[model samples]
Target: QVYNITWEVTNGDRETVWAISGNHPLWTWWPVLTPDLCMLALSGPPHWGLEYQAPYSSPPGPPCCSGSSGSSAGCSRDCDEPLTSLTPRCNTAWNRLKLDQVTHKSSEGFYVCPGSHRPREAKSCGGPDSFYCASWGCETTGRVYWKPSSSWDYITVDNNLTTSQAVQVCKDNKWCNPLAIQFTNAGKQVTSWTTGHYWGLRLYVSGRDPGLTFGIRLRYQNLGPRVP
Candidate 1:
């Protein structure tokens, strides 16, 4: 059964549910925010008698740095919807220039930080193993110190290292000092300081160890991409 009463103070001539006005909506008509400009402007049915949506003021948009460089030039605005996780796409000024898309990254990734290009997660220099991008490819965070493993106590001239062997001990084929091997006359320690030299990869020694007991230093340039 239906009940209808009268006497309600409302728009009489222009009355009916249409006169109910906006600010409130009928349960049947759902309101949804959409990116579609045309839809938001003319979505509801004209049959509703009254305008489903009232006139409102809104603008288009701003920069979204969806770019890898985080630069405005690289902003990747092509990002669509329905994501597996949050992905990168230039949408709003905030998501574009404040913080880059974090969850799912992209070269086409949008930026959150303005001005900066597509920057990776920032990292600090760790210990030896820690790596950072360098002009030469990658570089180490710290120097590696090494010492003689063999207990024999001497590398003599006769048994001196090969052209490459001498370099292996302190440094690679490259570097200031060249590769050379030397040994003592009879394991006898020499008092005279000879020219400083480099040993196997990553090592430098002071005074000619052509005799042992000479000073040695570990070559500090940690490996990265080999110099071509």
Candidate 2:
């Protein structure tokens, strides 16, 4: 029977040497015969040894501290080996600038508390103690809170309501009625046909057949009202 072998080198701080040979006494002496070679020989339980060459040269000796012999060779010489996992020094200047820019953007989307809505102005909804507009323009029942900018314009109901009941809920909320059902594919948006839950809309599409259809927000001319 033949066996396949895989070799991998990891975490070579200064330098790492690895070899794989048959489990025999002669295998250990193979390296002495070929000083320039770095690979191992493989065969049966009593296979003969063979020479193997490596593509790269071996690492250099320790680096010299002072510029002694003027030749700049020997101990202080740099190693030919490549560094695998070296933590580079951080740039404080760049980090400071990046952090400042992030702070500035976050301040722009600061949350405005409820009762701060000027009615005529574009006010945010759905937060703690704030006005939550249900169907029919009633913003007195559900609690409200600051709507983050990252929020989506959709409300997901998991109470397992029928298609008709879901429509009625949307109608009562006075918000855009449901338009299309949506699902997520590995954190991505995808169209869903299987109706596990339902979404309702406030805007009434007269004469439109309501089975398990989605709704759109009339005021925004976009999608739903709820922030994701």
Candidate 3:
């Protein structure tokens, strides 16, 4: 096994990249961000790295207004554009809006969200698989609590891992690197801590959320290792 880690503290971040194709492989990106669907409507990566889904083209969206490089004036803005040049871009740490297609154009300058215009839906986002184009953008999953300006601090997974297994998974840094691994007691806040190192994870089993199998907010350094 191999591990790759990069850190840029000035950017309020660190990047640990890799995929574990093992029996207990871990995936950093969600299944939704997985290829085969629309990333614009489904949301993809935030960093420079990318995962391009097939059929990478569609119709154009209404310019945010007059000449903005997007559709919804509220949800749209001029900033770092994706390599795919997706527009009407909904920004978030998790699931965000995405598109690199040519959809319908609006005749009247649209008011996006409350600040831009009356709440309305755009149709360039059609098809059973398409997202509803809104001045504020549409919804998907995981990012309900995310803002266009936030980054992910926790990972939502379906697997229920013991302290040892979880720490082993994290130490492998198979998906993300961590200088330290600390698990929370449960919920929206931390009530206690589950501490350990790669060698003795079995010695410190922490609490998991009652509602979610992986609900505990994972706390570790923007921070792992590997074996042959």
| TM-score of candidate 1 to 2 decimals | 0.11
- How many pairs of residues collide in each model? 36, 36, 15
Tell me the spans in candidate 1 whose CA falls farther than 4 Å from its real position: 1-62, 66-82, 85-228
- lDDT per residue for candidate 1 within 1-228, as digits (tens), equals 111111111111111111111222112211121111111122122221113333232211332333223436544342322233431112232321111222112222110110111124223312111211211112211111221222222221111123233222212111111112233232124222122221111111112101101121111121334323
lDDT of 1: 0.20
lDDT, candidate 2, 1-228, per-residue tens: 212221111111111123222323211111111111111111101111111212232221233222223334343222112212311101111221221122123221111111222142223433222212222232211111222211222222111223333332222221111111121231123122111111221111123211111111111111234223
Ranking by TM-score: 3, 2, 1
lDDT of 3 at 114: 11
Give the winner by TM-score. Answer: 3
The whole-model lDDT of each prediction reads 0.20, 0.20, 0.20
- Where model 2 places Cα greater than 4 Å from the true spot, the runs are 1-126, 134-155, 161-228
> Over all chains combined, what TM-score does candidate 2 have?
0.13
TM-score winner between candidates 2 and 3: 3
Tell me the tens digit of each residue's lDDT in model 3 across 25-144. 222211111111122221133221222311232212222222223234343232234424433222221111221111111221111011111123233422222212221333211211
